[PDB]
PDB file of C-alpha atoms and ligand atoms in Angstrom:
ATOM      1  CA  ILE A  21      23.523 -18.834 -17.440  1.00 20.99           C
ATOM      2  CA  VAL A  22      22.939 -21.357 -14.649  1.00 21.96           C
ATOM      3  CA  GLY A  23      19.488 -21.841 -13.148  1.00 19.68           C
ATOM      4  CA  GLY A  24      17.931 -19.569 -15.739  1.00 21.99           C
ATOM      5  CA  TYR A  25      15.299 -20.045 -18.419  1.00 21.25           C
ATOM      6  CA  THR A  26      15.015 -19.942 -22.208  1.00 24.42           C
ATOM      7  CA  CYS A  27      14.369 -16.268 -22.978  1.00 21.90           C
ATOM      8  CA  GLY A  28      12.456 -16.842 -26.178  1.00 21.20           C
ATOM      9  CA  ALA A  29      13.566 -15.956 -29.702  1.00 22.84           C
ATOM     10  CA  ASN A  30      14.628 -12.295 -29.900  1.00 26.75           C
ATOM     11  CA  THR A  31      13.087 -11.365 -26.533  1.00 25.73           C
ATOM     12  CA  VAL A  32      16.371  -9.612 -25.687  1.00 26.87           C
ATOM     13  CA  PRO A  33      16.889  -7.597 -28.930  1.00 26.43           C
ATOM     14  CA  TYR A  34      19.984  -5.772 -27.626  1.00 27.32           C
ATOM     15  CA  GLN A  35      21.864  -8.991 -26.838  1.00 27.31           C
ATOM     16  CA  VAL A  36      24.738  -9.637 -29.221  1.00 26.39           C
ATOM     17  CA  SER A  37      27.033 -12.608 -29.776  1.00 26.37           C
ATOM     18  CA  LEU A  38      30.703 -11.901 -30.488  1.00 26.32           C
ATOM     19  CA  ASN A  39      32.012 -14.464 -32.974  1.00 27.78           C
ATOM     20  CA  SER A  40      35.580 -15.277 -34.033  1.00 30.34           C
ATOM     21  CA  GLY A  41      34.697 -18.513 -35.801  1.00 27.86           C
ATOM     22  CA  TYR A  42      32.593 -19.433 -32.783  1.00 27.26           C
ATOM     23  CA  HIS A  43      30.645 -17.654 -30.034  1.00 25.59           C
ATOM     24  CA  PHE A  44      33.080 -16.498 -27.348  1.00 28.43           C
ATOM     25  CA  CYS A  45      31.389 -13.597 -25.540  1.00 28.83           C
ATOM     26  CA  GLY A  46      28.257 -11.536 -25.288  1.00 30.34           C
ATOM     27  CA  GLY A  47      27.769  -7.819 -25.800  1.00 34.69           C
ATOM     28  CA  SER A  48      25.076  -5.134 -25.855  1.00 34.92           C
ATOM     29  CA  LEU A  49      24.033  -2.915 -28.770  1.00 33.98           C
ATOM     30  CA  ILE A  50      23.912   0.704 -27.567  1.00 33.34           C
ATOM     31  CA  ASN A  51      23.182   2.319 -30.955  1.00 33.41           C
ATOM     32  CA  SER A  52      23.222   1.288 -34.618  1.00 31.79           C
ATOM     33  CA  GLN A  53      27.017   1.444 -34.809  1.00 28.87           C
ATOM     34  CA  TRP A  54      28.294   0.525 -31.346  1.00 31.04           C
ATOM     35  CA  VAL A  55      28.454  -2.457 -28.999  1.00 31.01           C
ATOM     36  CA  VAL A  56      29.549  -2.553 -25.348  1.00 33.00           C
ATOM     37  CA  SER A  57      31.269  -5.674 -24.009  1.00 33.36           C
ATOM     38  CA  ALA A  58      33.903  -6.704 -21.462  1.00 36.45           C
ATOM     39  CA  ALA A  59      37.537  -5.739 -21.991  1.00 34.63           C
ATOM     40  CA  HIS A  60      38.621  -9.292 -21.161  1.00 36.66           C
ATOM     41  CA  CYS A  61      36.671 -10.374 -24.250  1.00 41.46           C
ATOM     42  CA  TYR A  62      39.059  -8.422 -26.461  1.00 42.42           C
ATOM     43  CA  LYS A  63      40.292 -10.274 -29.528  1.00 43.11           C
ATOM     44  CA  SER A  64      41.218  -9.501 -33.113  1.00 42.86           C
ATOM     45  CA  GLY A  65      38.895 -10.578 -35.930  1.00 40.68           C
ATOM     46  CA  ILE A  66      35.565 -10.033 -34.196  1.00 38.94           C
ATOM     47  CA  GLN A  67      32.269 -10.418 -36.042  1.00 32.74           C
ATOM     48  CA  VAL A  68      29.226  -9.056 -34.243  1.00 28.45           C
ATOM     49  CA  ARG A  69      26.112 -11.191 -34.587  1.00 30.56           C
ATOM     50  CA  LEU A  70      22.786  -9.475 -33.936  1.00 31.90           C
ATOM     51  CA  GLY A  71      19.228 -10.794 -33.937  1.00 32.55           C
ATOM     52  CA  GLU A  72      20.442 -14.164 -32.674  1.00 32.40           C
ATOM     53  CA  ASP A  73      18.608 -16.865 -30.745  1.00 31.80           C
ATOM     54  CA  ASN A  74      20.011 -20.266 -31.710  1.00 30.13           C
ATOM     55  CA  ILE A  75      23.636 -19.394 -32.491  1.00 26.94           C
ATOM     56  CA  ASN A  76      24.119 -22.625 -34.476  1.00 29.42           C
ATOM     57  CA  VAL A  77      21.167 -22.239 -36.849  1.00 30.04           C
ATOM     58  CA  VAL A  78      20.423 -19.411 -39.286  1.00 29.99           C
ATOM     59  CA  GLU A  79      16.824 -18.620 -38.364  1.00 30.94           C
ATOM     60  CA  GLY A  80      16.201 -15.541 -40.493  1.00 29.11           C
ATOM     61  CA  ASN A  81      16.546 -12.465 -38.304  1.00 26.08           C
ATOM     62  CA  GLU A  82      20.329 -12.299 -37.987  1.00 25.57           C
ATOM     63  CA  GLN A  83      22.727  -9.558 -39.007  1.00 26.02           C
ATOM     64  CA  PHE A  84      26.427 -10.426 -39.156  1.00 26.63           C
ATOM     65  CA  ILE A  85      28.685  -7.365 -39.140  1.00 26.83           C
ATOM     66  CA  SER A  86      32.464  -7.251 -38.786  1.00 29.15           C
ATOM     67  CA  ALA A  87      33.939  -4.938 -36.177  1.00 29.95           C
ATOM     68  CA  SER A  88      35.957  -2.061 -37.635  1.00 32.74           C
ATOM     69  CA  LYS A  89      37.510  -0.952 -34.350  1.00 31.88           C
ATOM     70  CA  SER A  90      37.825  -2.099 -30.746  1.00 32.08           C
ATOM     71  CA  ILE A  91      38.523   0.202 -27.814  1.00 30.50           C
ATOM     72  CA  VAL A  92      39.469  -1.342 -24.482  1.00 26.55           C
ATOM     73  CA  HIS A  93      39.052   1.022 -21.524  1.00 27.24           C
ATOM     74  CA  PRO A  94      42.225   3.085 -20.981  1.00 27.72           C
ATOM     75  CA  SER A  95      42.496   1.878 -17.377  1.00 23.54           C
ATOM     76  CA  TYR A  96      41.636  -1.788 -17.882  1.00 21.46           C
ATOM     77  CA  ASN A  97      43.743  -4.014 -15.617  1.00 20.97           C
ATOM     78  CA  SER A  98      43.578  -7.641 -16.749  1.00 20.22           C
ATOM     79  CA  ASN A  99      45.060  -8.874 -13.468  1.00 20.27           C
ATOM     80  CA  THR A 100      42.214  -7.533 -11.301  1.00 24.36           C
ATOM     81  CA  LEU A 101      39.622  -6.982 -14.039  1.00 25.12           C
ATOM     82  CA  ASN A 102      39.098  -3.417 -12.820  1.00 23.82           C
ATOM     83  CA  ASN A 103      37.502  -1.317 -15.608  1.00 29.06           C
ATOM     84  CA  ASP A 104      36.425  -4.448 -17.499  1.00 32.90           C
ATOM     85  CA  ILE A 105      34.691  -2.671 -20.363  1.00 33.04           C
ATOM     86  CA  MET A 106      35.332  -2.287 -24.092  1.00 36.55           C
ATOM     87  CA  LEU A 107      33.597  -0.635 -27.045  1.00 35.30           C
ATOM     88  CA  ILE A 108      33.262  -2.208 -30.488  1.00 35.50           C
ATOM     89  CA  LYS A 109      32.368  -0.243 -33.616  1.00 32.30           C
ATOM     90  CA  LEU A 110      30.536  -1.957 -36.470  1.00 29.50           C
ATOM     91  CA  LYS A 111      31.919  -1.675 -40.013  1.00 28.39           C
ATOM     92  CA  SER A 112      28.405  -0.809 -41.150  1.00 27.41           C
ATOM     93  CA  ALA A 113      25.380   0.438 -39.221  1.00 29.35           C
ATOM     94  CA  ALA A 114      23.013  -2.296 -38.081  1.00 33.80           C
ATOM     95  CA  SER A 115      19.429  -2.214 -39.336  1.00 36.19           C
ATOM     96  CA  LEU A 116      17.366  -1.614 -36.214  1.00 35.97           C
ATOM     97  CA  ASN A 117      14.061  -3.465 -35.983  1.00 37.47           C
ATOM     98  CA  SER A 118      11.891  -5.273 -33.429  1.00 36.66           C
ATOM     99  CA  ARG A 119      14.486  -8.058 -33.162  1.00 35.48           C
ATOM    100  CA  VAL A 120      17.586  -5.851 -33.290  1.00 38.58           C
ATOM    101  CA  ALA A 121      17.392  -2.897 -30.912  1.00 38.36           C
ATOM    102  CA  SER A 122      19.678  -0.801 -28.737  1.00 41.14           C
ATOM    103  CA  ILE A 123      19.568  -0.609 -24.943  1.00 39.79           C
ATOM    104  CA  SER A 124      19.827   2.790 -23.257  1.00 41.36           C
ATOM    105  CA  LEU A 125      22.751   3.763 -21.050  1.00 42.62           C
ATOM    106  CA  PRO A 126      22.052   4.751 -17.437  1.00 42.84           C
ATOM    107  CA  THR A 127      21.752   8.371 -16.313  1.00 44.38           C
ATOM    108  CA  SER A 128      22.449   7.268 -12.748  1.00 43.66           C
ATOM    109  CA  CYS A 129      23.537   4.130 -10.899  1.00 45.38           C
ATOM    110  CA  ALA A 130      21.212   1.402  -9.633  1.00 45.82           C
ATOM    111  CA  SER A 131      20.604   0.589  -5.973  1.00 46.75           C
ATOM    112  CA  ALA A 132      20.949  -2.700  -4.112  1.00 46.60           C
ATOM    113  CA  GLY A 133      17.760  -4.744  -4.340  1.00 42.53           C
ATOM    114  CA  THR A 134      16.939  -3.644  -7.883  1.00 44.97           C
ATOM    115  CA  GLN A 135      15.952  -6.599 -10.062  1.00 45.86           C
ATOM    116  CA  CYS A 136      17.802  -7.055 -13.352  1.00 47.90           C
ATOM    117  CA  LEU A 137      17.810  -9.300 -16.404  1.00 50.31           C
ATOM    118  CA  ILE A 138      21.062 -11.107 -17.179  1.00 49.45           C
ATOM    119  CA  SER A 139      21.337 -13.024 -20.462  1.00 47.46           C
ATOM    120  CA  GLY A 140      23.760 -15.058 -22.540  1.00 45.59           C
ATOM    121  CA  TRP A 141      24.863 -18.274 -24.249  1.00 44.64           C
ATOM    122  CA  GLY A 142      27.230 -19.339 -21.483  1.00 42.21           C
ATOM    123  CA  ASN A 143      27.560 -22.602 -19.556  1.00 38.26           C
ATOM    124  CA  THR A 144      24.316 -23.736 -17.914  1.00 36.54           C
ATOM    125  CA  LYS A 145      25.877 -26.141 -15.402  1.00 35.14           C
ATOM    126  CA  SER A 146      27.281 -25.336 -11.956  1.00 32.51           C
ATOM    127  CA  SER A 147      29.271 -28.577 -12.002  1.00 35.56           C
ATOM    128  CA  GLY A 148      30.421 -29.781 -15.400  1.00 39.12           C
ATOM    129  CA  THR A 149      29.816 -28.258 -18.819  1.00 37.98           C
ATOM    130  CA  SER A 150      26.858 -27.739 -21.151  1.00 35.86           C
ATOM    131  CA  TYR A 151      26.559 -24.890 -23.631  1.00 34.11           C
ATOM    132  CA  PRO A 152      23.079 -23.950 -24.904  1.00 35.95           C
ATOM    133  CA  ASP A 153      22.264 -23.078 -28.488  1.00 35.24           C
ATOM    134  CA  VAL A 154      19.430 -20.700 -27.597  1.00 35.28           C
ATOM    135  CA  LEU A 155      19.644 -17.559 -25.455  1.00 35.55           C
ATOM    136  CA  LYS A 156      19.217 -18.059 -21.707  1.00 36.08           C
ATOM    137  CA  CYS A 157      17.767 -15.520 -19.250  1.00 36.44           C
ATOM    138  CA  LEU A 158      18.009 -14.905 -15.509  1.00 39.48           C
ATOM    139  CA  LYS A 159      16.297 -12.424 -13.204  1.00 38.79           C
ATOM    140  CA  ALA A 160      18.611 -11.431 -10.359  1.00 41.35           C
ATOM    141  CA  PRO A 161      18.785  -8.612  -7.799  1.00 40.87           C
ATOM    142  CA  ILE A 162      21.753  -6.331  -7.242  1.00 42.11           C
ATOM    143  CA  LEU A 163      23.399  -7.269  -3.944  1.00 41.44           C
ATOM    144  CA  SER A 164      24.678  -4.956  -1.231  1.00 41.54           C
ATOM    145  CA  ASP A 165      28.257  -3.831  -1.738  1.00 41.37           C
ATOM    146  CA  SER A 166      29.096  -5.233   1.700  1.00 42.50           C
ATOM    147  CA  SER A 167      27.946  -8.757   0.808  1.00 43.30           C
ATOM    148  CA  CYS A 168      29.879  -8.407  -2.451  1.00 46.07           C
ATOM    149  CA  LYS A 169      33.111  -7.372  -0.755  1.00 48.77           C
ATOM    150  CA  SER A 170      32.692 -10.001   1.967  1.00 46.95           C
ATOM    151  CA  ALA A 171      32.596 -12.702  -0.706  1.00 46.17           C
ATOM    152  CA  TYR A 172      35.659 -11.304  -2.483  1.00 45.44           C
ATOM    153  CA  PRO A 173      37.793  -9.504   0.156  1.00 45.73           C
ATOM    154  CA  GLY A 174      40.015  -6.817  -1.344  1.00 46.26           C
ATOM    155  CA  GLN A 175      38.951  -7.705  -4.896  1.00 45.96           C
ATOM    156  CA  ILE A 176      35.890  -5.496  -5.391  1.00 45.42           C
ATOM    157  CA  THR A 177      36.391  -1.934  -6.619  1.00 47.55           C
ATOM    158  CA  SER A 178      33.972   0.957  -7.054  1.00 43.99           C
ATOM    159  CA  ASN A 179      33.673  -0.132 -10.703  1.00 44.48           C
ATOM    160  CA  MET A 180      32.134  -3.489  -9.828  1.00 42.81           C
ATOM    161  CA  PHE A 181      28.934  -4.767  -8.252  1.00 39.65           C
ATOM    162  CA  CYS A 182      27.527  -8.181  -7.417  1.00 41.21           C
ATOM    163  CA  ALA A 183      24.164  -9.586  -8.439  1.00 45.10           C
ATOM    164  CA  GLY A 184      22.474 -12.924  -7.969  1.00 44.87           C
ATOM    165  CA  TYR A 185      21.728 -15.199  -5.034  1.00 44.64           C
ATOM    166  CA  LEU A 186      24.014 -16.027  -2.121  1.00 43.69           C
ATOM    167  CA  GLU A 187      22.289 -19.399  -1.663  1.00 39.10           C
ATOM    168  CA  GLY A 188      23.580 -20.483  -5.067  1.00 38.93           C
ATOM    169  CA  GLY A 189      21.885 -22.164  -8.008  1.00 40.73           C
ATOM    170  CA  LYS A 190      21.359 -19.066 -10.169  1.00 40.03           C
ATOM    171  CA  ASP A 191      24.190 -17.138 -11.808  1.00 39.17           C
ATOM    172  CA  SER A 192      25.833 -16.085 -15.083  1.00 39.53           C
ATOM    173  CA  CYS A 193      28.821 -18.159 -16.226  1.00 40.90           C
ATOM    174  CA  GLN A 194      31.624 -18.786 -18.741  1.00 42.89           C
ATOM    175  CA  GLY A 195      30.457 -17.722 -22.183  1.00 37.76           C
ATOM    176  CA  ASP A 196      28.112 -15.057 -20.823  1.00 38.35           C
ATOM    177  CA  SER A 197      31.024 -12.656 -20.306  1.00 37.80           C
ATOM    178  CA  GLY A 198      30.648  -9.276 -21.943  1.00 35.24           C
ATOM    179  CA  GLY A 199      26.879  -9.708 -21.930  1.00 35.61           C
ATOM    180  CA  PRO A 200      24.155  -7.411 -20.496  1.00 36.75           C
ATOM    181  CA  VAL A 201      22.712  -6.845 -17.037  1.00 37.82           C
ATOM    182  CA  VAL A 202      19.686  -4.616 -17.625  1.00 37.79           C
ATOM    183  CA  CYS A 203      17.813  -3.020 -14.754  1.00 37.88           C
ATOM    184  CA  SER A 204      14.830  -0.686 -15.070  1.00 36.09           C
ATOM    185  CA  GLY A 205      15.449  -0.471 -18.816  1.00 37.22           C
ATOM    186  CA  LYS A 206      19.088   0.597 -18.495  1.00 35.69           C
ATOM    187  CA  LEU A 207      22.351  -1.249 -19.158  1.00 36.02           C
ATOM    188  CA  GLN A 208      23.768  -1.206 -15.614  1.00 33.25           C
ATOM    189  CA  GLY A 209      26.217  -4.084 -15.812  1.00 40.18           C
ATOM    190  CA  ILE A 210      28.444  -6.237 -17.998  1.00 37.81           C
ATOM    191  CA  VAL A 211      29.085  -9.901 -17.153  1.00 35.40           C
ATOM    192  CA  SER A 212      32.660  -9.750 -15.845  1.00 40.71           C
ATOM    193  CA  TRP A 213      33.758 -12.394 -13.342  1.00 43.33           C
ATOM    194  CA  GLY A 214      33.138 -14.357 -10.155  1.00 44.38           C
ATOM    195  CA  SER A 215      34.134 -17.683  -8.586  1.00 43.45           C
ATOM    196  CA  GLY A 216      32.886 -20.812 -10.298  1.00 44.79           C
ATOM    197  CA  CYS A 217      29.220 -20.571 -11.249  1.00 45.11           C
ATOM    198  CA  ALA A 218      26.097 -20.562  -9.086  1.00 42.86           C
ATOM    199  CA  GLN A 219      28.165 -21.541  -6.041  1.00 43.52           C
ATOM    200  CA  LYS A 220      26.993 -20.696  -2.528  1.00 45.86           C
ATOM    201  CA  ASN A 221      28.204 -17.331  -1.205  1.00 44.77           C
ATOM    202  CA  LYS A 222      30.011 -16.550  -4.466  1.00 47.30           C
ATOM    203  CA  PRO A 223      27.765 -14.219  -6.524  1.00 47.02           C
ATOM    204  CA  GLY A 224      28.548 -12.956 -10.000  1.00 47.06           C
ATOM    205  CA  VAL A 225      30.635  -9.798 -10.374  1.00 48.43           C
ATOM    206  CA  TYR A 226      29.666  -7.195 -12.973  1.00 49.26           C
ATOM    207  CA  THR A 227      31.248  -4.069 -14.438  1.00 47.69           C
ATOM    208  CA  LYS A 228      29.388  -1.025 -13.083  1.00 49.35           C
ATOM    209  CA  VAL A 229      28.400   0.688 -16.329  1.00 46.57           C
ATOM    210  CA  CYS A 230      27.012   3.860 -14.744  1.00 43.81           C
ATOM    211  CA  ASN A 231      30.607   4.853 -13.911  1.00 45.51           C
ATOM    212  CA  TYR A 232      31.508   4.768 -17.609  1.00 47.86           C
ATOM    213  CA  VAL A 233      28.695   6.652 -19.329  1.00 45.09           C
ATOM    214  CA  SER A 234      30.798   9.792 -19.787  1.00 48.05           C
ATOM    215  CA  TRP A 235      33.655   7.774 -21.297  1.00 49.72           C
ATOM    216  CA  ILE A 236      31.286   5.793 -23.516  1.00 49.24           C
ATOM    217  CA  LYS A 237      29.499   8.851 -24.898  1.00 50.82           C
ATOM    218  CA  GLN A 238      32.680  10.840 -25.478  1.00 50.15           C
ATOM    219  CA  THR A 239      34.472   7.888 -27.068  1.00 53.69           C
ATOM    220  CA  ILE A 240      31.633   7.051 -29.469  1.00 57.60           C
ATOM    221  CA  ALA A 241      31.302  10.710 -30.448  1.00 54.46           C
ATOM    222  CA  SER A 242      35.012  10.888 -31.295  1.00 53.51           C
ATOM    223  CA  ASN A 243      35.254   7.611 -33.227  1.00 52.41           C
TER     224      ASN A 243
HETATM  225  C1  23M B 316      39.419 -13.264 -17.477  1.00 51.85           C
HETATM  226  C2  23M B 316      38.893 -14.313 -16.542  1.00 51.85           C
HETATM  227  C3  23M B 316      39.788 -15.237 -15.931  1.00 51.85           C
HETATM  228  C4  23M B 316      39.300 -16.233 -15.043  1.00 51.85           C
HETATM  229  C5  23M B 316      37.906 -16.315 -14.756  1.00 51.85           C
HETATM  230  C6  23M B 316      36.991 -15.397 -15.359  1.00 51.85           C
HETATM  231  C7  23M B 316      35.510 -15.456 -15.072  1.00 51.85           C
HETATM  232  C8  23M B 316      34.906 -15.858 -13.878  1.00 51.85           C
HETATM  233  C9  23M B 316      33.539 -15.743 -14.069  1.00 51.85           C
HETATM  234  C10 23M B 316      32.460 -16.010 -13.179  1.00 51.85           C
HETATM  235  C11 23M B 316      31.149 -15.772 -13.698  1.00 51.85           C
HETATM  236  C12 23M B 316      29.991 -16.009 -12.836  1.00 51.85           C
HETATM  237  N1  23M B 316      29.879 -17.193 -12.072  1.00 51.85           N
HETATM  238  N2  23M B 316      28.970 -15.033 -12.745  1.00 51.85           N
HETATM  239  C13 23M B 316      30.934 -15.295 -15.031  1.00 51.85           C
HETATM  240  C14 23M B 316      32.035 -15.041 -15.893  1.00 51.85           C
HETATM  241  C15 23M B 316      33.357 -15.267 -15.394  1.00 51.85           C
HETATM  242  N3  23M B 316      34.558 -15.109 -15.965  1.00 51.85           N
HETATM  243  C16 23M B 316      37.496 -14.398 -16.250  1.00 51.85           C
HETATM  244 CA1   CA B 317      20.986 -17.990 -35.484  1.00 51.67          CA
END
């Protein structure tokens, strides 16, 4: 997260860290047994870490649970990142509490102008590299589809939306991928891609979760 702020320990209880010996992507807890992340975050040997703030220090509210199964969207295209969404099932149900909670799925899509909360442990620099130990937060509005498509001609599909600021300075970044974009209490996006980080006229691109609710619910119910 570039141009953001320190969320505060466990202020984003649904935020998860995917670990394969190190933090490599974010995710969102949707119920005690399932996590939603980006398909491009797929990897074998994933351990889901919940209740995290400083990912390099055991602070006392963590829950480390190995993934038992991963399900990348049937139509995921790694070349274009269309349908960049994946589900991860926990080997054992997480113990829900004030610091480890699920985020509700949307019942309808969000409109341009809606403010959202984007979070993660990704790079905090627009130029160069610096990875934070504590969770970073960023408030950003959903942008018009036209401004999104103008920035990335021919690359934006109906399963993607842009959020952030065209002037630059505030954006999600490498390491935040797979993480949450929550608007009006609903998980509306997943950190997916973009161009550089916090660059002018190059907003972040997010997977449009409202298009996948039917798939998510049916998949979780059958697995
Ligand atoms: C699979 C793959 C290949 C090459 C680049 C990316 C990527 C761009 C990007 C841009 C942002 C951003 N500035 N919001 C966040 C995460 C991001 N991930 C992903
Ligand atoms: Ca920790």
